[PDB]
Symmetry: D2
Amino acid sequence: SIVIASAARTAVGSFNGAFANTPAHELGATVISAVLERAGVAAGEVNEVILGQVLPAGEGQNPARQAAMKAGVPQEATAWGMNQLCGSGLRAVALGMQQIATGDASIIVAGGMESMSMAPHCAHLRGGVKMGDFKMIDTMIKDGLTDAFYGYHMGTTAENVAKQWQLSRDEQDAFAVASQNKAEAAQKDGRFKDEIVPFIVKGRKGDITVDADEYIRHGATLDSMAKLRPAFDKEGTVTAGNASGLNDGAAAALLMSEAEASRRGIQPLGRIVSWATVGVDPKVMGTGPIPASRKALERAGWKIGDLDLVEANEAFAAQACAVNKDLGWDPSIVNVNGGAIAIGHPIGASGARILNTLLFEMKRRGARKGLATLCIGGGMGVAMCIESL
Amino acid sequence: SIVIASAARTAVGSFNGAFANTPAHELGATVISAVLERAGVAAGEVNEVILGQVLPAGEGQNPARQAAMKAGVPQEATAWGMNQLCGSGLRAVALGMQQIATGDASIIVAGGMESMSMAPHCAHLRGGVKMGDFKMIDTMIKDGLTDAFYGYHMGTTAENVAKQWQLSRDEQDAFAVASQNKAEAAQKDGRFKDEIVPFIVKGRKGDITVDADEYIRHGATLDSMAKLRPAFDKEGTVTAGNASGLNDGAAAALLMSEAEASRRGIQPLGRIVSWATVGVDPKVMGTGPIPASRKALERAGWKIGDLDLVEANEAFAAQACAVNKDLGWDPSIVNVNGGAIAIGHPIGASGARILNTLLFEMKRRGARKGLATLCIGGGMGVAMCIESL
Amino acid sequence: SIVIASAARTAVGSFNGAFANTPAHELGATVISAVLERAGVAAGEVNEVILGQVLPAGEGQNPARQAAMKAGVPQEATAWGMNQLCGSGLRAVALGMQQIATGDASIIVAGGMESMSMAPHCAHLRGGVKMGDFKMIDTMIKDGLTDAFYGYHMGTTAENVAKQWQLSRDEQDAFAVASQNKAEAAQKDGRFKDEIVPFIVKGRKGDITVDADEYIRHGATLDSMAKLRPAFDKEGTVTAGNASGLNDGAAAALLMSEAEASRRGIQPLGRIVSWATVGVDPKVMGTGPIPASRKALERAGWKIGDLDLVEANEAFAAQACAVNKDLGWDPSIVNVNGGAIAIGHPIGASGARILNTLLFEMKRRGARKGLATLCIGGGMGVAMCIESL
Amino acid sequence: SIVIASAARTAVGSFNGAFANTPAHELGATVISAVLERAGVAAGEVNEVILGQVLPAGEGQNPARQAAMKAGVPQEATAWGMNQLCGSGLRAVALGMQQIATGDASIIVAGGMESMSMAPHCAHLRGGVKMGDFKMIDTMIKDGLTDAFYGYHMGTTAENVAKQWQLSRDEQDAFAVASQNKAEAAQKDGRFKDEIVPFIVKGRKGDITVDADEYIRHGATLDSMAKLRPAFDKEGTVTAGNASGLNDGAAAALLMSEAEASRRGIQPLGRIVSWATVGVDPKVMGTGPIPASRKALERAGWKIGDLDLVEANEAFAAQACAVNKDLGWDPSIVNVNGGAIAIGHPIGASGARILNTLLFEMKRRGARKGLATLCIGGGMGVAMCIESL
């Protein structure tokens, strides 16, 4: 029924680092044309582009449409952006899967992009401020990392899960280190090369080709991890080291019917066998993946034990351990090449980033069933089940 | 298979007018509850809330989820915002229909919301400005009304359509006045009452209930219309008078399978027979509805001649006329109670707004087949065909 | 030896009132032209322009020079601004007196001007704000009204004078209401028209002539004052009622040696016989007038009791009562036409504003000896003794 | 009559360099304390503090008073800031002299301070921006360096002087490199150590003592000056290399009557024999020094040829050479240790800085008469004559 013919992602950049002044639709563009090249499909055959992106303030009208056009997709196809926070990138793949399934389209490019670096500061000033000081709001924090019901940062929701699941600092720190060592190990062996599509940072006094995840840290020590101070709760347990970071990146999938891919001689990275999205208490949003995953599994007709590979977004060490602890899947098959803590977390692009990794790892190790899942701010989870062919 | 059980929209506010300090999700909340009460469905039965929103900068995390919770949809439900600019409000409805059609959901609330008044000013200031002025960009103008590829305002795209279709000032002015006249007659006759859910503007020095579209002008003259100066092209033909405005509002639909409405005793407002979306040149984006309306009819198996009622959004007189002229539908069944030039145009909500108008007008006149269509910035169009039950 | 040959002030404007968008330099130009006109002195005879001004942020390079150039003063002449906060407007006259006393100038235009309304909001952003919110500071609050040592507003130094001299709510309100009622009467009888020169506020849709003190309240009641809440100390005694306001005006005086006025045949408004400036504790800055008036009087060889009229600025009912209480001059010769609670307080202009009032009333009633004194933020005073010729 | 008993200055710092985050008043407090100390004068004997300062926006209420207080000046003394742009620091000394000359004070601390690195960005936002981007203005550029009559930078006034006097790139560049090599030589022989009082930059992770001018360039080459492009006129002649820079510093002088020095046993740095300030056309404001110097010499009874040492500020090479050309003084007695091109240009501090410089070279080489002079944007100049005792 609906398969992913090809996929591609840029390397994930560090906050104000390599993509510092690069607008998300520029990276978007690169990824959309990679997926077409990669499958052998022409720009002109795309019906629509669906990109999740949570922080587009100042980027101009519909940046999804700017990405498509810049990548060569003609003015005839359509494009749209969408937000389900951290779930946006994965969610977008299921929404183009739906576009094909209802017969509204034949070929979609779907995924997500995000420039946390380029997120602006803002103020509402139409009414004027007659007397007194006013705040200039960091939009990446307000619109992307602050709970809207309790007023605190995602990090505190992580702390709520820590306390609730009784996850000690040492246990989260342990998890962190592992994801770094695993991310580092996979980068060193070229495991991220199929998925990555080098992005050219158009310079003035030099153009730079970025093709490596710059946020992974080499030789991460437990000692360094245990000396960091808690970032959200002054006497807390979550720190910079065991939480994901602020990052830039884009990632996408090229979707079509199974039969179309076959008419084209394409060898798909997998078949979308199910997806699901479920809400949870916004206070412990990190638990998102538990209910979404299981639903996903139930709609596919699979048992947790059937899964050969799993990508469960590393928002915070606290929430990842809780996810794994509750679902019980075998830890060795989850985030095999590392996670967000090491790799980075470009909010709107993250769900399609983890899809890429899942998809290129399933191919390279011959796994047949996989699942990607993320926790979403505001209390939500998104999960998708993929089967190789 | 999928029907519109109920529907509701707030009145449309004037810019920096009645909803001048109201956050879009507030407007949204009210409409999610309204569609819920109107159909006798309880919030706890809502699976997901889908809202189109184009300018949510500063409103914090995913305003769609903040509107769903404010309305009382439990935290176990899901919510997301999407953006296909002007067609967002109608595309949400389509996207929500798909959720039920693929069996991912049973009940969906969908439409759009917008607070153009509350759109902030912004600046990318992470680097630091070492010397010189810097701009504070109005996100309303940059993210909602400025072509991203040509750098000019929608008004200019209108002008291109004017010139191209050879639509003179008087013909554009004539259209506008007719729109005001029809919207004003509709207003006095109580034609807007069913669709409108009164919104309470929570005050300090008193509460204010708004239940009337405040941008419609009473007794609009042709003389006043002909004295205005061109707004975009210094020696052009589009004016403030023959273009839509900048406004705030929200509007939605409670969607469910026809079998489900029937198990509940609900008398739906319509059956979704088909929807379509197509791209066109961004420079003449106002031509968008032509291809998209025709696609939709084709998918529905209908002839233009089969339509009993049409709502084709009035971004600008020149594009409205070109659309009508090209499609050839009978002017007398298009925007029977007036259009966006008089009612206003709250960007993300405008398609759900027009869907409400269409749906309450088909029920009161007993029309059987209707279409809603809108042009989209960046060069796109969206249309949806509805059949009464 | 140095006389004030002529003087003029604009009407004082309400905060964001008549002069809401008129830069201070436009108002001092009209006052420069009026002093010249009023003493039969041409602009090519001016040696230098000295204008007190506390909040010139954003107006451009040296607004004293922009006033002088606008009034037609030759480019050969010089001009500078100075700032001793609320004593600025009077100090200036004292400083222009000094340039002729030491032989460096013959003819000076001295005084002050201020647009509190045009004061901007600001932030030091050269270093860059990595992330988080940051304050946009009101410069009129920060730079003109807050004590730099103690961190609280001028209104709390008022509270400190009230406690310390034990001034009740009631005594302060009566002082307040007597200030509005004497100023309304003087306005209604015409006593402000000789000192005010009309200001033209360049319109687009109309030029407006402003020749009346708009902050003065007509029919001010004891009751409405008595109902006010304390503004600075949630449970104090200074309110908006008994404190001066935030305002806009300019005011000046034209000086020359007495020998030079006799050579041109001008009948001067008075002789500067002495001035004095003295510090006090910043915490009771309201007391400034006491030692500064004392010292002026001793330098003039006069007894408090030799004075015939006195203008003692009303920063706050509390400090005005304290000052009158200690000096012990006959209250019936103080502010006979009302003071700053009713007229307003445009900070850098105020001392020239009250000098004007002093001068014109000395002339109309034939007073021979006068004194003008203000309290200054940061803990200081300035006083000036004037005798008629 | 009035002498300079002692003087002192901080090292001048580079834009966003050593004093990047130090408010102006801190640097003035250290110089107020160093002139007290250098003359055996205690702070309690200080009657008034006079500081030139052009850009104090956001520092709070009257920084002159905040530096005085920080230096321990009693709260019984007074303090005020003034603004005659570039001539501020030296005009202050002249007005402090006047204070003693007319017997209103016996002891004054006078000079300037300026923190161009701490100058903020601002915007007048009281009336609000209904729609449309607005500028955040750099207060250093607008209030400091932009001519208010013509709208262009000081650099362009420099261009007008170069064209008018026909100074070539080459002669300007040679001027610049001789300024850099004279200051460097001066710095290395310890000629700046008597005048400089060390400033402690209070750190967190350590305190740094600054006692060296850091803008001086070591081994500045002609070739590096000749390859620069013109900064203000895309095809002009003024560059960053031949203009002064953006800088931070403070500088002052302690003043008293000659008779009082003599009763204290002080050996003063010189006697102020006269000053003058004269206006010129704003467009060629760099020529300010010509008439102001001629007037001051006239007032002293001195011929150009009687001077033994001159400091003539180096705003720009072009205006410096024009001034030297016109005046005709021997170039070897001008800026003998370098000028502002090398040392920097902290606006309000500059004239006190170059005075410092004059005074310590006149004592070290035993020069009897000197003059200090600066060009002032808006079209002005100040000059001051000094003789040794």
